[PDB]
Design a protein around this ligand. Structure first.
Ligand SMILES: [Cl-]
Ligand SMILES: [Cl-]
Length: 129
């Protein structure tokens, strides 16, 4: 599914991400924009053999199992394929674990490089939340 901007903002809001660990909703929408372009089915292979899955490009090296990332972990205890659903619940639940981890939203490269330190409030402008 390719979410509309406000459609995704509203979905993330009702799943409790607005100001989760201090990160305003616009940060989560911005992250999703530049990780997946709002496409729940987005996947990308990394140089080390791990793969990033879904709307927030959650990595198989640490967070989910795909059975083809040797020596990796599955800290969200879910198959990576579950992170590709049209329903963002699984990705959000996993994202909440990730962001509580240590480096916060710096765990998302696109967030750190393209959202952090910018005006993210624009990502939810005009949305019914
Ligand atoms: Cl909507
Ligand atoms: Cl293994």
């Amino acid at each position: 599914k390719v979410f509309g901007r406000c459609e995704l903002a509203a979905a993330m809001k009702r799943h409790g991400l607005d100001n989760y660990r201090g990160y305003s909703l616009g940060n989560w929408v911005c992250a999703a924009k530049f990780e997946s372009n709002f496409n729940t089915q987005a996947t990308n292979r990394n140089t080390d053999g791990s793969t990033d899955y879904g709307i927030l490009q959650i990595n198989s090296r640490w967070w989910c199992n795909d059975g083809r990332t040797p020596g990796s972990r599955n800290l969200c205890n879910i198959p990576c394929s579950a992170l590709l659903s049209s329903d963002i619940t699984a990705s959000v639940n996993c994202a909440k674990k990730i962001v509580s981890d240590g480096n916060g939203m710096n765990a998302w490269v696109a967030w750190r490089n393209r959202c952090k330190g910018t005006d993210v409030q624009a990502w939810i402008r005009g949305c019914r939340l």
